[PDB]
Amino acid sequence: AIGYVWNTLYGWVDTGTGSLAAANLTARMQPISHHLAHPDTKRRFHELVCASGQIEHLTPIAAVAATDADILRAHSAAHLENMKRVSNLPTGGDTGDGITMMGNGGLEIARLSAGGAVELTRRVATGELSAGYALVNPPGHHAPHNAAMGFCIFNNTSVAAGYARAVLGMERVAILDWDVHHGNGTQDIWWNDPSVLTISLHQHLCFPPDSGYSTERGAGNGHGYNINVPLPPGSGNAAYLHAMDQVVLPALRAYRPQLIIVGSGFDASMLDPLARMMVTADGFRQMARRTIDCAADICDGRIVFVQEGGYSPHYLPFCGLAVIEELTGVRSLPDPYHEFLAGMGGNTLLDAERAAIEEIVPLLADI
Ligand SMILES: O=C(CCC1CCCC1)NO
Numbered sequence: 001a002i003g004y005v006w007n008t009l010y011g012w013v014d015t016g017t018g019s020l021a022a023a024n025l026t027a028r029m030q031p032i033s034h035h036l037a038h039p040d041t042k043r044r045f046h047e048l049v050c051a052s053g054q055i056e057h058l059t060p061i062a063a064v065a066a067t068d069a070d071i072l073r074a075h076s077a078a079h080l081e082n083m084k085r086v087s088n089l090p091t092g093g094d095t096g097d098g099i100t101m102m103g104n105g106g107l108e109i110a111r112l113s114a115g116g117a118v119e120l121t122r123r124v125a126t127g128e129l130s131a132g133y134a135l136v137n138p139p140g141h142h143a144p145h146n147a148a149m150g151f152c153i154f155n156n157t158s159v160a161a162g163y164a165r166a167v168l169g170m171e172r173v174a175i176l177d178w179d180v181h182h183g184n185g186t187q188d189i190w191w192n193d194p195s196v197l198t199i200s201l202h203q204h205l206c207f208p209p210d211s212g213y214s215t216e217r218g219a220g221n222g223h224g225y226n227i228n229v230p231l232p233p234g235s236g237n238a239a240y241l242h243a244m245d246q247v248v249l250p251a252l253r254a255y256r257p258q259l260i261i262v263g264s265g266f267d268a269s270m271l272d273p274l275a276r277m278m279v280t281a282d283g284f285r286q287m288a289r290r291t292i293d294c295a296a297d298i299c300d301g302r303i304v305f306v307q308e309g310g311y312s313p314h315y316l317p318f319c320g321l322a323v324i325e326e327l328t329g330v331r332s333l334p335d336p337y338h339e340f341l342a343g344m345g346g347n348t349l350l351d352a353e354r355a356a357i358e359e360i361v362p363l364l365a366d367i
Pocket residue numbers: 099139141142149150151179180181182207265267274308309310
């Protein structure tokens with residue numbers, strides 16, 4: 001049984017009329033119908049999950065709104081208070097960083113996004129489900145303990161991991177983040193805490209700026225329980241699967257989590273506007289396959305995927321479908337872009353890629 005979360009409101013997130021920041025007449029940033037983060041991209045993924053027939057192999061799980069208690073396991077009372085505040089504004093608005101906006105009442109959606117991750121986590125932990133994918137929106141991994149950031153209101157995977165820790169009594173949880181941007185929020189939240197191993201693969205210094213260096217290793221009892229794998233622009237399937245094999249999977253096996261949560265972004269894809277990486281649907285397929293197999297070996301198959309970023313409405317649905325197919329074991333459709341993308345490269349491990357990953361291998365000794 002493979003759980004699947006999609007709530008209609010995930011597709012109703014109001015991304016304004018700007019491209020990234022708001023439209024601005026003095027800067028001459030013309031308004032546009034689809035912001036970079038427009039919910040249509042993730043909606044097209046959900047619709048492909050249905051139209052492909054994958055939905056018939058999935059167990060639909062209703063999102064439940066994350067409570068104040070749930071949120072406070074990951075975030076400060078002050079941040080919760082502040083998002084209540086901004087969502088209660090007549091029109092809502094931007095939440096701090098000049099991208100991240102919410103509508104009036106957009107808190108409802110941020111709760112359903114975090115609660116989607118929590119609900120799926122709860123039901124995978126009870127053994128009701130073997131695994132699942134929570135196709136949530138808004139995303140989570142940039143939101144640190146005390147803020148919203150980079151389209152993220154609450155850190156969904158951290159709320160889920162906080163729930164697994166405090167409510168389910170798990171001693172150890174791993175969050176593996178392969179969204180192409182650094183999971184700075186997740187890293188912040190669990191920084192001093194060895195009970196949640198936080199791992200991020202990302203294009204080096206893509207977003208946020210000055211974040212995600214491999215020197216950022218946690219502090220105190222948490223020292224050695226945060227691992228960044230910054231990769232160079234242009235890295236493709238070869239670099240990513242090498243990072244999986246040399247760093248990620250050895251880290252998980254060393255750490256022995258009771259649950260693996262994957263912050264599953266597809267912005268590392270070959271066609272994404274918001275990074276310069278070259279991963280194809282087959283790359284994501286292999287990443288998902290390896291991680292699922294790892295969970296089968298070390299924590300009774302307990303794996304929960306939770307949607308992060310990804311900005312190609314064209315190609316993201318096929319990258320996400322590939323992950324879903326690895327969960328169901330039913331392989332319904334080809335990637336129709338495969339022939340087109342396969343000639344572009346990324347499938348050879350370049351020296352600079354190899355070297356970036358090798359810098360990380362020594363950190364495994366501290367788990
Ligand atoms: O996908 C995300 C958010 C993308 C950032 C890049 C533009 C500012 C927000 N992070 O992983």
